[PDB]
Design a protein around this ligand. Structure first.
Ligand code: HEM
Ligand SMILES: NCCc1ccc(O)c(O)c1
Length: 444
């Protein structure tokens, strides 16, 4: 078969369709019009956007396709070097870092990060306790303070102290503006600003790395695990520059996807008072202590379904790219040559009615009551295979912990009847999402 293609702009091909503040949402509507697969061209490039489980299940075959650096990864490499998110699978550093870090990202390791995550989670609860009557919460704003701070502490025992600030730590300022300057190229002076922001970031990370080496200190952070770890295959440790790239990667790549998830989840729950009540009821039943234990977080199952359903509707890291390792036919109908690229459009996958049923636009956490009912590769918010999100257990333990506590400690009002507005950076979030809290007065 011959692939549909969206509207073209003379010599710029489909490029100007990406000249927009909301390009994922623009691609979703094209997929609505054109179906499970379309060709997208720009000067010098072509890729194909996939939307059906039928096709994505083959694109997720790792004997046939591997991770491609385009978009999210390629421009981000300018700040995260050959960290895990921005390295090709065949780069020696990717496989080294993968084998060394997998153990520090498992469910087991979350027990070691648990206390630092509760540290920051408590600051968030205390902030909201301490608002006056008539004040309100800026949700993605507070979520982003929390996830950056949690990553900083779990990653390299460094405190950005975001809940003490109107103006973020200069590193965060630099990293935010550096992701902005990366993302903005997707369509095209402050080149020396980027160079300054990179240098702010490296100098800080290399400092903490040297300081930790000089001190000999052992703590419960990822930096300790990186300075200590040896790859079983090569027998080598990571070098100091690579360790710095990983720390920046966890911050640049991990914080926003995770605050986005918390924000959408809260958005869905306030728009669906029956499901908020069910999740509040589980939080009260389970979180019986002043501060949550790791084990109690594992017990918040409904809260976990809530998060999964939020990720289904609005996967906050919304697309990833693959290349064909050899000539191959996709779907029985589309021949591809080696090197041919594909984009997996996750929010559209997650709306595949053949897989989810007809109610795909509905918020329904009970969909995830039995995960084995979901066909393979139908739900991919953490990507695929050996290149899937190393931070997934981190991200979900964090979101479950935090949502669980917010639900234990507060009732919520959508006091403005907020109209969803999805801002896109490298990630997705509900821009301007605001709520009022009313404390249940449960002491920490
Ligand atoms: C809800 C939050 C998150 C979502 C939805 C998410 C999603 C994803 C996705 C889709 C990819 C695949 C990218 C690709 O194929 O090009 C990925 C990779 C990755 N993510 Fe996340 N992520 C989240 C949180 C985090 C956190 C908290 C960390 C902290 C370390 C993190 C670190 C990474 C890294 C290092 C990779 C590359 C892994 C590899 O290729 O070896 N992520 N993530
Ligand atoms: N760790 C999440 C990093 C990330 C952010 C945006 C994306 O589109 C993506 O594929 C991955």
């Amino acid at each position: 078969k011959e692939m549909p293609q969206p509207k073209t702009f003379g010599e710029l091909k489909n490029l100007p369709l990406l000249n927009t503040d909301k390009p994922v949402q623009a691609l979703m509507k094209i997929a609505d019009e054109l179906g499970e697969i379309f060709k997208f061209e720009a000067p010098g490039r072509v890729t194909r956007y996939l939307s059906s489980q039928r096709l994505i299940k083959e694109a997720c075959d790792e004997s046939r396709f591997d991770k491609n650096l385009s978009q999210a990864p390629k421009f981000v490499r300018d700040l995260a070097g050959d960290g895990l998110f921005t390295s090709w699978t065949h780069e020696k550093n990717w496989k080294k870092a993968h084998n060394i870090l997998l153990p520090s990202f498992s469910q087991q390791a979350m027990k070691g990060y648990h206390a630092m995550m509760v540290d920051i989670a408590v600051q968030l609860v205390q902030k909201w306790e301490r608002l006056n009557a008539d004040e309100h919460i800026e949700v993605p704003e507070d979520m982003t303070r929390l996830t950056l701070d949690t990553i900083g502490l779990c990653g390299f025992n460094y405190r950005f102290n975001s809940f003490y600030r109107d103006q973020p730590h200069p590193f965060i300022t630099s990293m935010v503006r550096a992701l902005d300057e990366a993302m903005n190229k997707l369509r095209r002076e402050n080149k020396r600003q980027f160079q300054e922001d990179i240098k702010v970031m490296n100098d800080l990370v290399d400092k903490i790395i040297a300081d930790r080496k000089a001190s000999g200190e052992q703590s419960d952070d990822l930096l300790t695990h990186m300075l200590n770890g040896k790859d079983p295959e090569t027998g080598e440790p990571l070098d100091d520059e690579n360790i710095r790239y990983q720390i920046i990667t966890f911050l640049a790549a991990g914080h926003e996807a995770t605050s986005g998830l918390l924000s959408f989840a809260l958005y869905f729950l306030v728009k669906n008072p029956h499901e908020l009540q069910k999740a509040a009821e589980e939080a009260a039943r389970v979180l019986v202590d002043p501060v949550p234990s790791h084990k109690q977080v594992k017990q918040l199952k409904y809260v976990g379904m809530v998060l999964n359903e939020a990720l289904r509707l609005w996967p906050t890291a919304p697309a990833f790219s693959l290349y064909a390792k050899e000539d191959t036919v996709l779907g029985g109908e589309y021949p591809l040559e080696k090197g041919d690229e594909l984009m997996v459009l996750i929010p559209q996958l997650h709306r595949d009615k053949t897989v989810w049923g007809d109610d795909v636009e509905e918020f329904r956490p009970e969909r995830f009551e039995n995960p084995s009912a979901i066909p393979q590769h139908a739900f991919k918010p953490f990507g695929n295979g050996q290149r899937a999100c190393i931070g997934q257990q981190f991200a979900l333990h964090e979101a479950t912990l935090v949502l669980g506590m917010m639900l234990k400690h507060f009732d919520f009002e959508d006091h403005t009847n907020y109209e969803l507005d999805i801002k896109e950076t490298l990630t997705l979030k509900p821009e301007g999402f605001v709520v009022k809290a009313k404390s249940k007065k449960i002491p920490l």
